[PDB]
């Protein structure tokens, strides 16, 4: 055994390196001219950042 | 005879028909949304859905 009260120095994060997040305070839904992207018979929805 | 029309009443009938052809088409064209298409042949066009 290794009894020493050793500190964990090496640690990893596979996620995003950010500490601030943008949130909605007052929701809303508005009409739009374009509703989605289409490819042949397929159709993908619009995802905003 | 059931089948068969009367020739002397042709123009009379035809005219009325044209009348309904118009009446049945008296509408305003509504604007619906679109979708941005990326099919190779209509690349980047906005097709109305």
Curated annotation (Swiss-Prot), chain B:
Localisation: Virion
Residues spanning the signal sequence: none
Quaternary structure, from the entry: Homodecamer; each decamer is made up of two conformers of VP2, called VP2A and VP2B. 12 homodecamers assemble to form an icosahedral capsid. Interacts with protein mu-NS; in viral inclusions.
Function: Inner capsid protein that self-assembles to form an icosahedral capsid with a T=2 symmetry, which consists of 120 copies of VP2, with channels at each of its five-fold vertices. This capsid constitutes the innermost concentric layer of the viral mature particle.
Homology family: Belongs to the orthoreovirus lambda-1 protein family.
Name under which the protein is recorded: Inner capsid protein lambda-1
UniProt organism field: Reovirus type 3 (strain Dearing) (T3D)
Location of this fragment in the whole protein: 345 to 393 of 1275
């Amino acid at each position: 055994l290794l009894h020493a009260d050793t500190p964990r120095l090496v640690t990893w994060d596979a996620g995003l390196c950010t500490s601030f997040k943008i949130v909605p305070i007052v929701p809303a839904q508005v009409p739009q001219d374009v509703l989605a992207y289409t490819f042949f018979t397929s159709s993908y929805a619009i995802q905003s950042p | 005879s059931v089948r068969g029309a009367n020739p002397l009443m042709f123009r009379a009938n035809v005219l009325h028909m044209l009348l309904e052809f118009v009446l049945d088409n008296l509408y305003l064209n509504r604007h619906t949304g679109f979708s941005q298409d990326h099919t190779p042949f209509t690349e980047g066009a906005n097709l109305r859905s």
